[PDB]
Amino acid sequence: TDKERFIASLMARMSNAEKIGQLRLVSVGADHPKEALMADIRAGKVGAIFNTVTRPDIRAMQDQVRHSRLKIPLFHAYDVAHGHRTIFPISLGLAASWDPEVVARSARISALEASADGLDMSFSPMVDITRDARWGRVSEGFGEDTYLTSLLSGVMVRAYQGSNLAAPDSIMAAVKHFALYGAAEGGRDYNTVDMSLPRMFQDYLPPYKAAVDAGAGAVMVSLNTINGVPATANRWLLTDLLRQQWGFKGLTISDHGAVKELIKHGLAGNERDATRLAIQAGVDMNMNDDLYSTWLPKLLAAGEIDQADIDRACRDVLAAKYDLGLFADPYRRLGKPPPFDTNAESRLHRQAAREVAREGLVLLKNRDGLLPLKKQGRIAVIGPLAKSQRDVIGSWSAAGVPRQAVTVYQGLANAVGERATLLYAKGANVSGDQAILDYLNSYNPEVEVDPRSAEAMLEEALRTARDADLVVAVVGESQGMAHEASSRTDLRIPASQRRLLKALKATGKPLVLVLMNGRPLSLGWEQENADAILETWFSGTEGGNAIADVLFGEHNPSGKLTMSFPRSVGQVPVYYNHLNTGRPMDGKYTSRYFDEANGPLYPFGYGLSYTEFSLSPLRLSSERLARGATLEARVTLSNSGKRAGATVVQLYLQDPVASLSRPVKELRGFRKVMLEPGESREIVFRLGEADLKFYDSQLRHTAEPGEFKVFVGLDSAQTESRSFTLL
Amino acid sequence: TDKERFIASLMARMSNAEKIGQLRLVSVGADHPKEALMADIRAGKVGAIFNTVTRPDIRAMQDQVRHSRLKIPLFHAYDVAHGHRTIFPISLGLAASWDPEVVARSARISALEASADGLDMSFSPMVDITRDARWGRVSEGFGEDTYLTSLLSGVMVRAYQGSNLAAPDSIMAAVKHFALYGAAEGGRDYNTVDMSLPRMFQDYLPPYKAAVDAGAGAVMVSLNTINGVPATANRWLLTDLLRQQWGFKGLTISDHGAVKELIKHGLAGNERDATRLAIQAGVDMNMNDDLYSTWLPKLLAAGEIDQADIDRACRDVLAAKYDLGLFADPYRRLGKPDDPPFDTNAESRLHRQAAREVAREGLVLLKNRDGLLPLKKQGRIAVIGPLAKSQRDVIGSWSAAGVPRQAVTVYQGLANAVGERATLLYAKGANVSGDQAILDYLNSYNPEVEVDPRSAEAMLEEALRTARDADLVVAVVGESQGMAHEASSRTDLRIPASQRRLLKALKATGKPLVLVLMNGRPLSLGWEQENADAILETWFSGTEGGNAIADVLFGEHNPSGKLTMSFPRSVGQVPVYYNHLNTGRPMDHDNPGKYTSRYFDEANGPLYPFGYGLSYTEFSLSPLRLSSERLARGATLEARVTLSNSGKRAGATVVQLYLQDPVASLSRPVKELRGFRKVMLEPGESREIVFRLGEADLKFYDSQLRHTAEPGEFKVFVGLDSAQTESRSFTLL
Ligand SMILES: [Mg+2]
Ligand SMILES: [Mg+2]
């Protein structure tokens, strides 16, 4: 109770002006010039800063606080999504590791590097469920599965915050985006979200609850409407659910201009009413638009808000700073009153980035064991992503320096050394569409546009392929194609690069596709025509080295998809945990399309190996399960091939008769197992009542007696099943 | 209460076997051979028949009733969706008329022809809201707008049922598909529907309620889950909402095998449990799977259902037969035993004048560069494309008793128009699809698509030869009717690739290129909008389609059709609809930034918006004027505008009134249709349009489902489409 007494005694001494100042979250920029901001900090008008990311800059801002009456320290936040300076694979690629220890390592190193630069908080993890591949922000989440995303949500929060939020190598997690942000209609960023309460509670909300239960200090509120109500004005979401049902005791933070955006949503006619709706809904901290500082005094004096609205918000800010240790030592992450190079090579974590990046790479095709490659012969390395440092570190690359990143080309060159001969040709620009190139280059030069014609680049690539034994085509999206507000109407590799691929195929040379992308892609032609396909997402600062490690067989690919790959954008959404319908497709009068093959091209949990694995028959510990008892599902996994390697044994559950139509299967467990040739492991899954419960039409959360079907396999599509009955 | 006394007295006489027999709805088929069915009718084991559609066949079934103990008459139902024998345009084309009197005429004639063949009931109107162009059944509805679909829902029900359901020219309407069937996830037929209650009540449910309020005798229950619960097992939907809140007093009917499908949905492990769920939810009549007849006796004897469950269902069936006049005369729609035999399909029994006049009204002019249309009837006209000579496709999907051989193709309509004055040159140009797997699908069950066995190249060279020998090209392209049918969901909204290759080759001849589109859903037409000289949307225009299309192409009728569903630029933009929410970061002309709600790889917004359609004349609207700046509760205000024909040809257009509630307790749509007026004007003629608005127009369902109009600003928009408007505001007190 030291914390409650400290905050009560401080707040008893604060003016409303001082309490309102604590709610203000700003960045140095056009709207807040540095010297005016310094003056506001000295006056106690600023609660926190984002987007200031070096120790001397952060220390300088904290120094201004000694001029305010109460000297309440700032906290400093940043978007450390998948690395701070050492960039790990994007989250969608981290998820493909199926290894909470790998994901925890990326988060722990991110927090170590961020805190070493003086940051206290990250706007991460992003834990929104994504079933729509068009949305640019699918790169930031962990895929489509509620169970896996919820597990990794808690893993990220614990890895960031550690055993103690006051530790100088801990940062506070601000879990985002609360809530349902990835259900945007049409996959258009910021668009309308409309869903039933059972779907919301069963499928979309659990990853946010998992973050709260892992002790997340902060929640960042989403930009979207939920069933007509913007999250930023949603008292049900932020008060009734988050605080009163889930027991969240931390800090709610608006997104950038989100309070002011209530006017565009048509919830408010003016900034005064927008401010009232946000503070009364339960938004504590106001990012950038300064509406709280502008309007809260007038709102209170007019009796339009209560003192308790200000006091709740201010208490939450002070409680976060308290937990971060900033009242004990506001410089605990900023060292003592020797300068250093923030971007020194010595401050990076290349070993960790390379080991983590290996685990997320997904082998999608490997005809006649073309991979792994031998380090010999003439290897053509062709495509616009082969030499791209900007793209390998992905979207939301924080303080990542492209020039420090290892490209696919450089990774191959490092791997072969003097062996083999690499032949480079760019082959195509990332896009043939000038309006797309101008969008991607609209703010910063993100995409190198080769001034040569497409035809000249193609002729050069064909000459290179002719001079080679095999072709490694490095193709896909630029990182700006899978970013905030970068929604796509087409899930294929860009047309300029597909023209290149078809030309390379026509040479007859063995064709290896290395894909870079931040979302599921439509790969029908590639699955038919490529000899091998390696999904590399955006693999980060050591991406090229991790990719070469897999291509030459130093690492046996072990990644498995956490999001279904649709055959085309016209099939969206496709996800493994769908309902059966009354007329399931297995034949015209079924739930299907007629103009394309049905189901995903690659299902949830899919990924190949350089070795072969066998599963023994699934055995359940009983055919009947008593209430409050545990069931064991056992299988033996064996490495039946010639190479050491890992795979992921997946356990799915179906409730085939229920008060609601339940999914054809739902992930309830998994085990990643590394085996030498001829090794076995007995895998034991534990199932309890908590695994069997679901939200019905009235949101009763219970398990109904009846049959459950247990499936075990190496992907969602290739399983063996046994049933038991819950009594 | 003379009706309820008649029904109470009859039910007092009936065994549970006889009561359960009334709930059985069957068709002659593999599962129910004709002679087995005849024996079941004689035993009182059949309540009703569907898909028996000629007087002699229906008379023969009614004749078996004489042999049962209680002699309770059958009713006979069919899918009379957009015509019985005289086929009108599909519903999406009827909607494009924006004319309740045109839609009423199609429904009245349908009921006239169906009842003349002895039918008592149609499984129509289909009134599901459709915002997803991929769904095959978009052709069957009225488009994306709740106001227009709700208005046409009531119009269809009143036109079918007339002033008296016992009239021999009336049929009962079984409104479908209750509910939300058109929101199928992925646009995959029968798929999961998941939506918020405020969206359900504001946008999707009103067309079903409009049908109930117009006095629809029946409701057909949908095949989909609603928020996890199949409609067929949904007590909230069928009892709490339909009966208790809406006061529906008629008959609920299952879809084909829908009760048994509760097992596949995973609500039941067996047929006994599926039967219990459906009857207790409020499904009265069991279509084809015979689960009610198989399981209701065992369920009642085990105390798993109540006698009241059987009694309610049986009462609903008997009340429908009573309203249809079938207890007063079971032969009232079947003439007299003295009546001589006749040809069911005689020309004399068709209504071609009504089909031709109605089909004219739904045709949408999408493009007309430099006034190419209307055409002069002279010179050499190449008529090219796989739909040019298609009788099967012009009558559309759900063509009921329509006879393809009686239909007027686009080619034949052009031949009828030009006579000796011009020379038509025909070439097929391409098959409807170049994809053999698609042709295999379309010829599954019934061979419906003529396949030219020649190579695509040979057909293209023939079409190019034909175009070269002509003064202009009329390309008749789009979907076959099997592409926009039940379970025909598309992943591509473009004209098929084989026909797009044909159009690109035709464009390269430099001949003027006129596109006549046939289709049952919005199409992606980016290339066509850029490259065609003119584009006429004809949907599937029915038995007189080719004549109505020629009437427009040669300027006998000035196109007046307007879209009721937004045409997306590509399938990757689905869904696109006009009454969307603004978001916090809108992308529009006034908000064109990078960090907005938009795609980056394609132009944004629909290619053609809701309410869009061109004319051969030009129209002007005067400034919008409101009768007051303030509206008191209990009062009406008037929005006034003058429409003028400022061109040289007579023609109609549609003035559209939209409302926005710019500040509300939930985010409200950027615009919502609240009125319209279709006006025919001579050149230089003007019409003062007066729209009436009240509190009823201003209400929405909030998060607690209170249906309220909040004080504050309302914006009134008037224009000739949803994208070309101006606004004036008033304040509700
Ligand atoms: Mg169960
Ligand atoms: Mg309002």
Side-chain angles (χ1 to χ4, degrees), chain A residues 451-511:
Chain A
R452 292 179 293 165
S453 72
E455 295 69 32
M457 283 192 279
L458 279 171
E459 282 174 318
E460 187 195 31
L462 289 182
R463 234 148 42 245
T464 301
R466 170 175 332 127
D467 290 336
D469 295 314
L470 71 91
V471 178
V472 174
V474 191
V475 286
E477 303 177 318
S478 67
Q479 53 84 28
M481 294 180 180
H483 207 337
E484 175 179 0
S486 293
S487 301
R488 287 190 75 195
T489 58
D490 186 343
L491 299 176
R492 292 173 297 181
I493 293 167
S496 66
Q497 298 176 60
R498 286 190 287 109
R499 180 178 174 192
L500 170 62
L501 290 184
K502 292 186 185 195
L504 291 170
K505 176 57 182 196
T507 67
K509 297 292 176 177
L511 178 62

Coordinates of all heavy atoms in Angstrom, one line a residue, chain A residues 451-511:
Chain A
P451 N 16.5 3.4 -63.1 CA 16.1 4.3 -64.2 C 16.0 3.5 -65.5 O 15.3 4.0 -66.4 CB 17.3 5.3 -64.3 CG 18.5 4.5 -63.8 CD 17.9 3.7 -62.7
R452 N 16.5 2.3 -65.6 CA 16.5 1.4 -66.8 C 15.0 1.0 -67.1 O 14.2 1.0 -66.1 CB 17.4 0.2 -66.6 CG 18.9 0.5 -66.6 CD 19.7 -0.8 -66.4 NE 19.5 -1.4 -65.1 CZ 19.9 -2.6 -64.8 NH1 20.5 -3.4 -65.6 NH2 19.6 -3.0 -63.5
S453 N 14.7 0.7 -68.3 CA 13.4 0.2 -68.7 C 13.2 -1.2 -68.1 O 14.2 -1.8 -67.8 CB 13.2 0.2 -70.2 OG 13.9 -0.9 -70.8
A454 N 12.0 -1.6 -67.9 CA 11.6 -3.0 -67.4 C 12.3 -4.0 -68.4 O 12.9 -5.0 -67.9 CB 10.1 -3.2 -67.3
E455 N 12.2 -3.8 -69.7 CA 12.7 -4.7 -70.7 C 14.2 -4.9 -70.6 O 14.7 -6.0 -70.6 CB 12.3 -4.1 -72.1 CG 10.8 -4.0 -72.4 CD 10.0 -3.0 -71.5 OE1 10.5 -1.9 -71.2 OE2 8.8 -3.3 -71.3
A456 N 15.0 -3.8 -70.4 CA 16.5 -3.8 -70.2 C 16.8 -4.6 -69.0 O 17.8 -5.4 -69.0 CB 17.0 -2.4 -70.1
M457 N 16.1 -4.4 -67.9 CA 16.4 -5.2 -66.6 C 16.0 -6.6 -66.8 O 16.8 -7.5 -66.3 CB 15.5 -4.6 -65.5 CG 16.1 -3.3 -65.0 SD 15.3 -2.7 -63.4 CE 13.8 -2.0 -64.0
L458 N 15.0 -7.0 -67.6 CA 14.6 -8.4 -67.9 C 15.7 -9.0 -68.7 O 16.0 -10.2 -68.4 CB 13.2 -8.4 -68.6 CG 12.0 -8.2 -67.7 CD1 10.7 -8.1 -68.5 CD2 11.8 -9.5 -66.7
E459 N 16.2 -8.3 -69.7 CA 17.2 -8.9 -70.7 C 18.5 -9.2 -69.8 O 19.0 -10.3 -70.0 CB 17.4 -8.0 -71.8 CG 16.4 -8.0 -72.9 CD 16.5 -7.0 -74.0 OE1 16.8 -5.8 -73.7 OE2 16.3 -7.4 -75.2
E460 N 18.8 -8.3 -68.9 CA 20.0 -8.5 -68.0 C 19.8 -9.7 -67.1 O 20.7 -10.5 -67.1 CB 20.3 -7.2 -67.2 CG 21.6 -7.4 -66.5 CD 21.9 -6.5 -65.3 OE1 21.0 -6.0 -64.7 OE2 23.1 -6.2 -65.1
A461 N 18.6 -9.8 -66.5 CA 18.3 -11.0 -65.6 C 18.3 -12.3 -66.4 O 18.8 -13.3 -65.9 CB 16.9 -10.8 -65.0
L462 N 17.8 -12.3 -67.7 CA 17.8 -13.5 -68.5 C 19.2 -13.9 -68.9 O 19.5 -15.1 -68.8 CB 16.9 -13.3 -69.7 CG 15.4 -13.2 -69.4 CD1 14.6 -13.1 -70.7 CD2 15.0 -14.4 -68.6
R463 N 20.1 -13.0 -69.2 CA 21.5 -13.2 -69.5 C 22.2 -13.8 -68.3 O 23.0 -14.7 -68.4 CB 22.2 -11.9 -69.9 CG 22.9 -12.0 -71.3 CD 22.9 -10.7 -72.1 NE 23.2 -9.5 -71.2 CZ 22.4 -8.5 -71.0 NH1 21.2 -8.5 -71.6 NH2 22.7 -7.6 -70.1
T464 N 21.8 -13.3 -67.1 CA 22.4 -13.8 -65.8 C 22.0 -15.2 -65.5 O 22.8 -16.0 -65.2 CB 22.0 -12.8 -64.7 OG1 22.6 -11.5 -65.1 CG2 22.6 -13.2 -63.3
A465 N 20.7 -15.5 -65.7 CA 20.1 -16.8 -65.4 C 20.8 -17.8 -66.4 O 21.2 -18.9 -66.0 CB 18.6 -16.8 -65.6
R466 N 20.9 -17.4 -67.7 CA 21.6 -18.3 -68.7 C 23.0 -18.7 -68.3 O 23.4 -19.8 -68.5 CB 21.6 -17.6 -70.1 CG 22.5 -18.2 -71.1 CD 22.3 -17.5 -72.5 NE 21.1 -16.8 -72.6 CZ 20.9 -15.5 -73.0 NH1 22.0 -14.8 -73.2 NH2 19.7 -15.0 -73.1
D467 N 23.7 -17.8 -67.6 CA 25.1 -17.9 -67.2 C 25.2 -18.7 -65.9 O 26.3 -19.0 -65.4 CB 25.9 -16.6 -67.0 CG 26.1 -15.9 -68.3 OD1 26.2 -16.5 -69.4 OD2 26.3 -14.7 -68.3
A468 N 24.0 -19.1 -65.3 CA 24.0 -19.7 -63.9 C 23.5 -21.2 -64.0 O 22.9 -21.6 -65.0 CB 23.2 -18.9 -63.0
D469 N 23.7 -21.9 -62.9 CA 23.2 -23.3 -62.6 C 21.8 -23.3 -62.0 O 21.0 -24.1 -62.3 CB 24.2 -24.0 -61.7 CG 25.5 -24.2 -62.4 OD1 25.5 -24.6 -63.6 OD2 26.6 -23.9 -61.8
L470 N 21.5 -22.2 -61.3 CA 20.1 -22.1 -60.7 C 19.9 -20.7 -60.3 O 20.9 -19.9 -60.3 CB 19.9 -23.1 -59.5 CG 20.7 -22.8 -58.2 CD1 19.9 -21.9 -57.3 CD2 21.1 -24.1 -57.5
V471 N 18.7 -20.3 -60.1 CA 18.2 -18.9 -59.9 C 17.6 -18.8 -58.5 O 16.7 -19.6 -58.2 CB 17.3 -18.4 -61.0 CG1 16.8 -17.0 -60.7 CG2 17.9 -18.5 -62.4
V472 N 18.1 -17.9 -57.7 CA 17.5 -17.5 -56.4 C 16.8 -16.1 -56.6 O 17.5 -15.1 -56.8 CB 18.5 -17.5 -55.2 CG1 17.8 -16.9 -54.0 CG2 19.0 -18.8 -54.9
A473 N 15.5 -16.1 -56.8 CA 14.7 -14.9 -57.1 C 14.2 -14.4 -55.7 O 13.5 -15.1 -55.0 CB 13.5 -15.2 -58.0
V474 N 14.6 -13.1 -55.4 CA 14.3 -12.5 -54.2 C 13.2 -11.4 -54.5 O 13.6 -10.4 -55.1 CB 15.5 -11.9 -53.4 CG1 15.1 -11.5 -52.0 CG2 16.7 -12.8 -53.5
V475 N 12.0 -11.7 -54.1 CA 10.8 -11.0 -54.7 C 9.8 -10.9 -53.6 O 9.9 -11.5 -52.5 CB 10.2 -11.9 -55.8 CG1 11.1 -11.7 -57.1 CG2 10.0 -13.3 -55.5
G476 N 8.8 -10.0 -53.8 CA 7.7 -9.8 -52.8 C 7.4 -8.3 -52.7 O 7.4 -7.6 -53.7
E477 N 7.0 -7.9 -51.5 CA 6.6 -6.5 -51.2 C 7.8 -5.7 -50.6 O 8.7 -6.3 -49.9 CB 5.5 -6.5 -50.1 CG 4.3 -7.3 -50.5 CD 3.3 -7.4 -49.4 OE1 3.7 -7.5 -48.2 OE2 2.1 -7.2 -49.7
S478 N 7.8 -4.4 -50.9 CA 8.6 -3.5 -50.0 C 7.9 -3.3 -48.7 O 6.6 -3.5 -48.6 CB 8.8 -2.2 -50.8 OG 7.6 -1.4 -51.0
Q479 N 8.6 -2.9 -47.7 CA 8.0 -2.8 -46.3 C 6.9 -1.8 -46.2 O 6.1 -1.9 -45.4 CB 9.1 -2.6 -45.3 CG 10.0 -1.3 -45.6 CD 9.4 -0.1 -45.1 OE1 8.6 -0.1 -44.1 NE2 9.7 1.0 -45.8
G480 N 7.0 -0.7 -47.1 CA 5.9 0.3 -47.1 C 4.6 -0.2 -47.6 O 3.6 0.5 -47.5
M481 N 4.6 -1.4 -48.3 CA 3.3 -2.0 -48.8 C 2.5 -2.7 -47.7 O 1.4 -3.0 -47.9 CB 3.7 -3.0 -49.9 CG 4.2 -2.3 -51.1 SD 4.6 -3.6 -52.4 CE 5.2 -2.5 -53.7
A482 N 3.2 -3.0 -46.5 CA 2.6 -3.7 -45.4 C 2.9 -2.9 -44.1 O 3.7 -3.3 -43.3 CB 3.1 -5.1 -45.3
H483 N 2.3 -1.7 -44.1 CA 2.5 -0.7 -43.0 C 1.1 -0.1 -42.7 O 0.1 -0.4 -43.3 CB 3.4 0.4 -43.5 CG 4.2 1.1 -42.5 ND1 3.7 1.2 -41.1 CD2 5.3 1.8 -42.5 CE1 4.6 1.8 -40.4 NE2 5.6 2.2 -41.2
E484 N 1.1 0.7 -41.6 CA -0.1 1.5 -41.3 C -0.6 2.2 -42.6 O 0.2 2.8 -43.4 CB 0.2 2.6 -40.3 CG -0.9 3.5 -40.0 CD -0.6 4.5 -38.9 OE1 0.5 4.5 -38.3 OE2 -1.5 5.3 -38.6
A485 N -1.9 2.1 -42.9 CA -2.6 2.8 -43.9 C -2.3 2.2 -45.3 O -2.8 2.7 -46.3 CB -2.4 4.3 -43.9
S486 N -1.4 1.2 -45.4 CA -1.0 0.5 -46.7 C -1.9 -0.7 -47.0 O -1.3 -1.8 -47.1 CB 0.4 0.2 -46.7 OG 1.2 1.4 -46.7
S487 N -3.2 -0.6 -47.2 CA -4.1 -1.7 -47.5 C -4.0 -2.0 -49.0 O -3.9 -1.0 -49.8 CB -5.5 -1.4 -47.0 OG -5.5 -1.1 -45.6
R488 N -4.0 -3.3 -49.4 CA -3.9 -3.8 -50.7 C -5.2 -4.4 -51.2 O -5.9 -5.1 -50.4 CB -2.8 -4.8 -50.8 CG -1.4 -4.2 -50.7 CD -0.3 -5.3 -51.1 NE -0.3 -5.5 -52.5 CZ 0.3 -6.6 -53.1 NH1 0.9 -7.5 -52.4 NH2 0.3 -6.7 -54.4
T489 N -5.5 -4.2 -52.5 CA -6.6 -4.8 -53.2 C -6.2 -6.1 -54.0 O -7.1 -6.7 -54.6 CB -7.3 -3.8 -54.2 OG1 -6.3 -3.4 -55.1 CG2 -7.9 -2.6 -53.5
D490 N -4.9 -6.4 -53.9 CA -4.3 -7.5 -54.7 C -3.2 -8.1 -53.8 O -2.5 -7.3 -53.2 CB -3.6 -6.9 -56.0 CG -3.0 -7.8 -57.0 OD1 -2.8 -9.0 -56.6 OD2 -2.7 -7.3 -58.1
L491 N -3.3 -9.4 -53.6 CA -2.4 -10.1 -52.7 C -1.2 -10.8 -53.4 O -0.4 -11.5 -52.7 CB -3.1 -11.1 -51.8 CG -4.2 -10.6 -50.9 CD1 -5.0 -11.7 -50.2 CD2 -3.6 -9.6 -49.9
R492 N -1.1 -10.6 -54.7 CA -0.1 -11.2 -55.5 C 1.3 -10.5 -55.3 O 1.3 -9.3 -54.9 CB -0.4 -11.3 -57.0 CG -1.6 -12.2 -57.3 CD -2.0 -12.1 -58.7 NE -2.5 -10.7 -59.0 CZ -3.0 -10.4 -60.2 NH1 -3.0 -11.2 -61.3 NH2 -3.4 -9.1 -60.4
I493 N 2.4 -11.2 -55.6 CA 3.6 -10.5 -55.8 C 3.3 -9.4 -56.9 O 2.6 -9.6 -57.8 CB 4.7 -11.5 -56.3 CG1 5.1 -12.5 -55.2 CG2 5.9 -10.8 -56.9 CD1 5.9 -13.7 -55.7
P494 N 3.9 -8.2 -56.8 CA 3.7 -7.1 -57.8 C 4.0 -7.6 -59.2 O 4.8 -8.4 -59.5 CB 4.7 -6.0 -57.4 CG 4.8 -6.2 -55.9 CD 4.8 -7.7 -55.7
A495 N 3.1 -7.0 -60.2 CA 3.1 -7.4 -61.6 C 4.5 -7.3 -62.2 O 4.9 -8.2 -63.0 CB 2.1 -6.6 -62.3
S496 N 5.3 -6.3 -61.9 CA 6.7 -6.1 -62.4 C 7.5 -7.3 -62.1 O 8.3 -7.8 -62.9 CB 7.3 -4.9 -62.0 OG 7.6 -4.9 -60.6
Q497 N 7.3 -7.9 -60.9 CA 8.2 -9.0 -60.4 C 7.6 -10.3 -60.9 O 8.4 -11.2 -61.2 CB 8.3 -9.0 -58.9 CG 9.0 -7.7 -58.4 CD 8.9 -7.7 -56.9 OE1 9.5 -8.6 -56.3 NE2 8.3 -6.7 -56.3
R498 N 6.3 -10.4 -61.1 CA 5.7 -11.6 -61.7 C 6.1 -11.8 -63.1 O 6.3 -12.9 -63.6 CB 4.2 -11.7 -61.5 CG 3.8 -11.9 -60.1 CD 2.3 -12.2 -59.9 NE 1.6 -11.0 -60.1 CZ 0.8 -10.7 -61.2 NH1 0.7 -11.5 -62.2 NH2 0.2 -9.5 -61.2
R499 N 6.2 -10.7 -63.9 CA 6.7 -10.7 -65.3 C 8.1 -11.3 -65.3 O 8.4 -12.2 -66.1 CB 6.6 -9.3 -65.9 CG 7.1 -9.2 -67.3 CD 7.0 -7.8 -67.8 NE 7.5 -7.6 -69.1 CZ 7.7 -6.4 -69.7 NH1 7.4 -5.3 -69.1 NH2 8.3 -6.3 -70.9
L500 N 9.0 -10.8 -64.3 CA 10.4 -11.3 -64.2 C 10.3 -12.8 -63.8 O 11.1 -13.6 -64.5 CB 11.0 -10.6 -63.0 CG 12.4 -11.1 -62.5 CD1 13.4 -11.0 -63.6 CD2 12.9 -10.3 -61.3
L501 N 9.5 -13.2 -62.9 CA 9.4 -14.7 -62.5 C 9.1 -15.5 -63.8 O 9.7 -16.6 -63.9 CB 8.4 -14.9 -61.4 CG 8.9 -14.3 -60.0 CD1 7.8 -14.7 -59.0 CD2 10.3 -14.8 -59.6
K502 N 8.1 -15.1 -64.6 CA 7.6 -15.9 -65.7 C 8.8 -16.0 -66.7 O 9.0 -17.1 -67.3 CB 6.3 -15.3 -66.3 CG 5.2 -15.4 -65.4 CD 3.9 -15.0 -66.0 CE 2.7 -15.1 -64.9 NZ 1.4 -15.0 -65.6
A503 N 9.5 -15.0 -67.0 CA 10.7 -14.9 -67.9 C 11.8 -15.9 -67.3 O 12.3 -16.7 -68.1 CB 11.2 -13.5 -68.0
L504 N 12.0 -15.8 -66.0 CA 13.1 -16.7 -65.4 C 12.6 -18.2 -65.5 O 13.5 -19.1 -65.7 CB 13.3 -16.3 -63.9 CG 14.0 -15.0 -63.8 CD1 14.0 -14.6 -62.3 CD2 15.4 -15.0 -64.3
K505 N 11.3 -18.5 -65.3 CA 10.8 -19.9 -65.4 C 11.1 -20.4 -66.8 O 11.6 -21.6 -66.9 CB 9.3 -19.9 -65.1 CG 8.6 -21.2 -65.2 CD 9.3 -22.3 -64.4 CE 8.5 -23.6 -64.6 NZ 8.9 -24.6 -63.5
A506 N 10.9 -19.6 -67.8 CA 11.0 -20.0 -69.3 C 12.5 -20.3 -69.6 O 12.7 -20.9 -70.7 CB 10.5 -18.9 -70.1
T507 N 13.5 -19.9 -68.8 CA 14.9 -20.3 -69.0 C 15.1 -21.8 -68.8 O 16.2 -22.3 -69.2 CB 15.9 -19.5 -68.2 OG1 15.7 -19.9 -66.8 CG2 15.8 -18.0 -68.4
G508 N 14.2 -22.5 -68.1 CA 14.4 -23.9 -67.6 C 15.3 -24.0 -66.5 O 15.5 -25.2 -66.0
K509 N 15.9 -23.0 -65.9 CA 16.8 -23.1 -64.8 C 16.0 -23.4 -63.5 O 14.9 -23.0 -63.4 CB 17.7 -21.9 -64.5 CG 18.6 -21.5 -65.7 CD 19.7 -22.5 -65.9 CE 20.6 -22.2 -67.1 NZ 21.7 -23.2 -67.2
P510 N 16.6 -24.2 -62.6 CA 15.9 -24.4 -61.3 C 15.7 -23.0 -60.6 O 16.6 -22.2 -60.7 CB 16.9 -25.3 -60.4 CG 17.8 -25.9 -61.5 CD 17.8 -25.0 -62.7
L511 N 14.5 -22.8 -60.1 CA 14.0 -21.5 -59.6 C 13.6 -21.6 -58.1 O 12.7 -22.4 -57.8 CB 12.9 -21.1 -60.5 CG 12.2 -19.7 -60.1 CD1 13.3 -18.6 -60.2 CD2 11.0 -19.4 -61.0

